[PDB]
Ligand binder design. Structure first.
Ligand SMILES: CCO[C@@H](O)[C@H]1CCC/C=C/CCNC(=O)c2c(O)cc(O)c(Cl)c2CC1=O
Ligand SMILES: CCO[C@@H](O)[C@H]1CCC/C=C/CCNC(=O)c2c(O)cc(O)c(Cl)c2CC1=O
Lengths: 211, 211
């Protein structure tokens, strides 16, 4: 199953590089941004479903789910939102707001503003050096978009991950110094602090050895 | 990705049908049998690794993991044991002990003996009307064996489920009256009662909405 490679729009590559290298202290803001995106996508499939009810049948439950995978130093944020087609992943995430945030930043702006420029997605590079966005739109097959903050990303038809009925998974490969975001306590503390007013259930998946 | 269909050896079909239909009370024994199988497979990759250390690299952690999936009425039991090749799944599970258990049964035997006849796998039909066995041996690709207790099963190259590095997942589609096995409390109670002496960590995956 062959990967396709695409070039990032120049300013996006610009944004990603300063973030992956930054010494900024409050890296935990990435989670609010990703939950905010998840909530948005859930709004869209819900609003969409107002006039097209069958759009919900691929995954009737509306949720945001966070799943620590300690062994792989991975953190996943899933939602059963509207999802993105292959062409949406390519367009939305790489090939097409941005520059103005970098300008605000260089003047003293707090990266927490990132979401107000519409580019909070990229805040994930505060805690991760690599990401896979796995997405299933009702309108397309399941696809994997992958980036390590370089100048190019890949998109691959998904034959390796669990089927999500509909929606998007952000699979973050955490940096070695950022492994705290795998911890149930840390995660819950960050959720409560910055994501108080979310319309959808936020589920936390915890793995505990029984005794 | 095309399915292949195989016929069950007659006595196996025999065994499965009486179990899926039985009014037997103590259906919870299925879990000890599946944990026992998981432990066995883990023994085999560990013993195997004694003379062939690199066999462990596909999945360095040795664990048994149970994952309730309430939305799908599914219960998964995973291990990172030795796993089964496509030919092993076909051979082991369908096409090749058994009859003597059915004879013990018809004389008054308790189905809890099933494991002593080497066929405890089939006890899963006490709680499930359908199963998918997903397996990855170091020696083959990932495959899905599926049965609903009929006279035939299917085997399909796996392009739809998460990659397991190595091992086996039993995905049980629980009957409507058996949904109690999705419950953290129930599961823990059954583990402690019948699986006290297990050499490997038994991990329980619990999904909890945060507030
Ligand atoms: C600037 C890049 O574009 C994005 O940020 C957008 C894409 C366009 C805007 C909204 C589209 C609807 C579907 N959204 C998603 O699938 C999505 C999600 O369900 C969680 C996320 O964490 C991100 Cl990232 C995205 C994708 C996402 O939020
Ligand atoms: C009678 C049918 O044969 C089986 O029962 C056997 C297959 C032959 C014996 C042992 C083989 C080593 C690998 N075992 C597995 O992958 C396995 C597992 O890791 C969990 C299970 O729950 C079952 Cl079921 C099996 C498969 C299993 O235990």
């Amino acid at each position: 199953m062959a990967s396709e490679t695409f070039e990032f729009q120049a300013e996006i590559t610009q944004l990603m590089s300063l973030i992956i290298n930054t010494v900024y202290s409050n890296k935990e803001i990435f989670l609010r941004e990703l939950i905010s995106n998840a909530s948005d996508a859930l709004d869209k499939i819900r609003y969409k479903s107002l006039s097209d009810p069958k759009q919900l049948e691929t995954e009737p439950d509306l949720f945001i789910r966070i799943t620590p995978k300690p062994e792989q130093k991975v953190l996943e944020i899933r939602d059963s939102g509207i999802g993105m087609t292959k062409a949406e992943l390519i367009n939305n995430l790489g090939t097409i707001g941005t520059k103005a945030f970098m300008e605000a930043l260089s003047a003293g702006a707090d990266v927490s503003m990132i979401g107000q420029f519409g580019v909070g997605f990229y805040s994930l590079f505060l805690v991760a050096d690599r990401v896979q966005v796995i997405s299933k739109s009702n309108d397309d097959e399941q696809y994997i978009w992958e980036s390590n903050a370089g100048g190019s990303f890949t998109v691959t038809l998904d034959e390796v991950n669990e089927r999500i009925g509909r929606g998007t998974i952000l699979r973050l490969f955490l940096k070695d110094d950022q492994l705290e975001y795998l911890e149930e306590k840390r995660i819950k503390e960050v959720i409560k602090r910055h994501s108080e007013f979310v319309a959808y259930p936020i589920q936390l998946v915890v793995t505990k050895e029984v005794e």
